[PDB]
Amino acid sequence: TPSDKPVAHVVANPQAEGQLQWLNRRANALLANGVELRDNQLVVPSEGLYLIYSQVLFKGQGCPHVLLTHTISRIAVSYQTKVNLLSAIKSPCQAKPWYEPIYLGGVFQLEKGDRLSAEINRPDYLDFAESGQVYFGIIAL
Amino acid sequence: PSDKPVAHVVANPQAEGQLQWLNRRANALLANGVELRDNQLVVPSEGLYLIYSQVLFKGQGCPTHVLLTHTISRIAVTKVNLLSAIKSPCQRAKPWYEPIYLGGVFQLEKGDRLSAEINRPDYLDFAESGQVYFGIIAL
Amino acid sequence: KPVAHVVANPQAEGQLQWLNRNGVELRDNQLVVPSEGLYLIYSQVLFKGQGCPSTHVLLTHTISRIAVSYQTKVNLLSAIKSPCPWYEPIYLGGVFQLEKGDRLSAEINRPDYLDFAESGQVYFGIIAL
Ligand SMILES: CC(C)(O)c1ncc(-c2ccc3nc4n(c3n2)[C@@H]2CN(C4)C(=O)c3cccc(OC(F)F)c32)cn1
Numbered sequence: 001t002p003s004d005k006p007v008a009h010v011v012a013n014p015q016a017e018g019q020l021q022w023l024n025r026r027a028n029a030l031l032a033n034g035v036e037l038r039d040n041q042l043v044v045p046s047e048g049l050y051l052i053y054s055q056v057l058f059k060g061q062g063c064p065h066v067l068l069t070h071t072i073s074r075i076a077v078s079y080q081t082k083v084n085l086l087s088a089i090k091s092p093c094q095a096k097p098w099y100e101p102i103y104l105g106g107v108f109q110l111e112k113g114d115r116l117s118a119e120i121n122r123p124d125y126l127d128f129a130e131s132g133q134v135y136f137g138i139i140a141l
Numbered sequence: 142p143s144d145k146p147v148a149h150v151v152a153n154p155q156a157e158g159q160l161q162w163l164n165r166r167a168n169a170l171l172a173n174g175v176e177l178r179d180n181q182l183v184v185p186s187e188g189l190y191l192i193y194s195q196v197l198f199k200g201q202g203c204p205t206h207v208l209l210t211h212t213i214s215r216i217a218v219t220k221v222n223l224l225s226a227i228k229s230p231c232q233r234a235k236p237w238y239e240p241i242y243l244g245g246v247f248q249l250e251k252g253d254r255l256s257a258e259i260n261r262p263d264y265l266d267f268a269e270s271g272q273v274y275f276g277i278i279a280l
Numbered sequence: 281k282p283v284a285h286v287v288a289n290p291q292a293e294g295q296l297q298w299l300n301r302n303g304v305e306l307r308d309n310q311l312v313v314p315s316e317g318l319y320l321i322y323s324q325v326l327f328k329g330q331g332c333p334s335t336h337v338l339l340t341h342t343i344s345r346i347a348v349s350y351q352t353k354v355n356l357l358s359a360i361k362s363p364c365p366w367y368e369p370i371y372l373g374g375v376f377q378l379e380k381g382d383r384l385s386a387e388i389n390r391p392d393y394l395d396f397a398e399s400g401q402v403y404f405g406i407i408a409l
Pocket residue numbers: 051052053104105106139141145191193244245246278279280320322323324371372373374407
């Protein structure tokens with residue numbers, strides 16, 4: 001049986017300077033059943049409950065103060081500003097290399113035309129030495 | 142359309158001296174039988190559930206052996222500790238930030254009450270939305 | 281709609297071995313996909329230690345896919361943590377389209393640091409959507 005559930009799982013472009021850019025045209029990544037990726041945002045095709053998730057991986061070669069943030073935001077139709085749905089702050093430095101993963105997840109009622117963004121404050125600290133470390137997705141329940 | 146019991150409640154940024162959960166806010170929900178009664182999530186049916194919660198603490202400098210705790214408890218129709226974490230933000234102004242994330246899968250029974258509590262609500266950070274939450278997902 | 285929730289065997293210490301109790305099979309420490317379709321794959325592992333050593337400790341947790349039509353191993357989700365008593369949990373989860381016969385594995389690099397006391401914190405599963 002073929003599912004018609006709006007789903008997305010986009011991955012970060014490891015070659016995008018000073019930014020966390022989401023791609024669907026990669027192995028084990030997808031945009032299906034109405035979900036679109038427009039201006040680095042996931043656009044919701046229909047109203048309903050959705051599971052929203054994102055993971056980023058930060059890495060630094062040592063400690064030089066550094067604040068790392070990762071946020072999933074929602075912009076509703078006819079609105080312009082992002083309202084935080086999920087957000088986390090980490091302080092990796094309280095020269096050995098440090099690693100800081102941030103995982104955000106939750107269930108949210110979304111409306112048709114909503115735009116979701118998964119953003120960070122310090123893309124200079126993003127790590128891409130391996131696949132599956134930086135991602136963002138939604139699944140209609 | 143799924144009939145899986147789900148919940149995602151957020152802290153009241155105005156409720157001083159407490160970590161009070163709200164479902165009647167934008168981007169917060171109680172669906173498929175889950176209820177929020179007496180600051181607790183009430184389980185509608187038996188089964189495996191993913192339980193999660195994040196709280197963010199922030200202080201304006203370390204003058205002091207401050208202990209920060211975050212716990213998720215279960216009360217059955219028997220009180221058990223499900224998830225717990227302790228953090229010591231003070232090694233020794235210079236602001237500090239301390240997030241505590243708790244997550245896990247637990248077998249819950251119908252009528253179970255889940256609570257997500259902290260010991261220092263005076264250190265809770267509310268300068269931004271989406272930082273303090275409590276949720277459950279039936280599997 | 282098949283589901284699978286498997287937990288770490290606390291008696292097979294020194295290796296992250298999975299224990300089962302829907303129709304998703306557990307063969308050779310891997311979850312085997314029964315049919316073509318979409319799936320949420322999640323997991324959690326818990327690490328702990330009594331202190332820090334000279335050699336820099338790196339903790340990793342990865343969920344891989346061995347596609348049946350090509351037989352190679354590709355990361356689906358991965359995370360690294362540098363804990364330097366300490367406790368370090370690692371979470372993963374995402375929706376992937378998978379084919380019949382695909383094998384999923386959830387592995388770590390330091391089983392000597394695994395925490396077997398927490399069953400509700402060392403697990404691996406899938407749910408067909
Ligand atoms: C509704 C639906 C699709 O059927 C479903 N959603 C989620 C799960 C599930 C069960 C156990 C899990 N343990 C973990 N997860 C699980 N997901 C991940 C990662 N990590 C560990 C978390 O602590 C976590 C926190 C918040 C959401 C989150 O899910 C993420 F996909 F959005 C996670 C099962 N079923």
